[PDB]
Amino acid sequence: EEGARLLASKSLLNRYAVEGRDLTLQYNIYNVGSSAALDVELSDDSFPPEDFGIVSGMLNVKWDRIAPASNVSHTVVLRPLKAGYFNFTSATVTYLAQEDGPVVIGFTSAPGQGGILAQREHFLDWAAFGVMTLPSIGVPLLLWYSSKRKYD
């Protein structure tokens, strides 16, 4: 009898979980009304094709079910290709309400950009970058200690 319809906004949770992490987009629903909605539509219209790849090509998922039994799929597995700057553009979640029929055009677009550098040559990236140069850390100290032992 009330509203509280789909609010599946894409948030900038981590931007770094593990090396080669594939984004697990998840959709949240919070509704208390006793009625039901039909003809779900999950479309990946606004996604970066260069940095994130969709599992089932162009995702166009139709569910048309309101039941605690189960759901078709809400765990979208975006598989990245290479390290760089990734943008969480948006995720299209429309509903073809059987009560009315026209598309409920709703997609949450956010300017969330994150950087993941090369894992092998954030934490692992910057750590590997810092530990890359070995001689500059030890050789000056080696010479200093040699001078100390020659003088002490």
């Binding site: 509280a4 948030s11 949770l13 981590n14 770094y16 979980a17 697990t24 629903i29 919070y30 509704n31 208390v32 006793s34 039901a36 309101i66 039941a67 605690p68 039994a69 189960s70 759901n71 954030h122 934490f123 910057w126 810092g130």
Partner: protein
């Protein structure tokens, strides 16, 4: 509706970096496709005495609590059907326990390992500038001797 086959698929939620970020919601996906035809009815989930607003099911129990106050995954969540919820609505004012009302069934959740990282994953990058203080001290020594 008797949970003849107790399908129990437990998976955890990343919950971002709850120590630094604010998106601290622990929503664990304990999938339970029991031998039931639960449809078009709000199967209410009472966990720790709290009735979660159930939408399209939830089977994903979502404790929207801070990590310091939600370092727990083991929870006994009772799933009540419409009649059981109606009975509970009147029994609760009578100081009646959750288990003395005819229930639908119960689910046990175990997701130890809450929140999994470092507090600051970016500010430590600027700490690499501290290594130049060693060469600065060496330059000060050069000024001295």
């Amino acid at each position: 509706e008797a949970c003849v086959e107790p399908q129990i698929t437990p998976s955890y939620y990343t919950t971002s970096d709850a120590v630094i970020s604010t998106e601290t919601v622990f929503i664990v996906e304990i999938s339970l496709t029991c031998k039931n035809r639960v449809q078009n009815m709000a199967l209410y989930a009472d966990v720790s005495g709290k009735q979660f607003p159930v939408t399209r099911g939830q089977y994903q129990v979502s404790w929207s609590l801070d990590h310091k106050s939600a370092h727990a995954g083991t929870y006994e969540v009772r799933f009540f059907d419409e009649e059981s919820y109606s009975l509970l609505r009147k029994a609760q004012r009578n100081n009646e326990d959750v288990s003395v009302i005819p229930p639908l069934f119960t689910v046990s959740v175990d997701h130890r390992g809450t929140w999994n990282p470092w507090v600051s994953t970016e500010v430590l990058a600027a700490a690499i500038g501290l290594v130049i203080y060693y060469l600065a001290f060496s330059a000060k020594s050069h000024i001295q001797a």
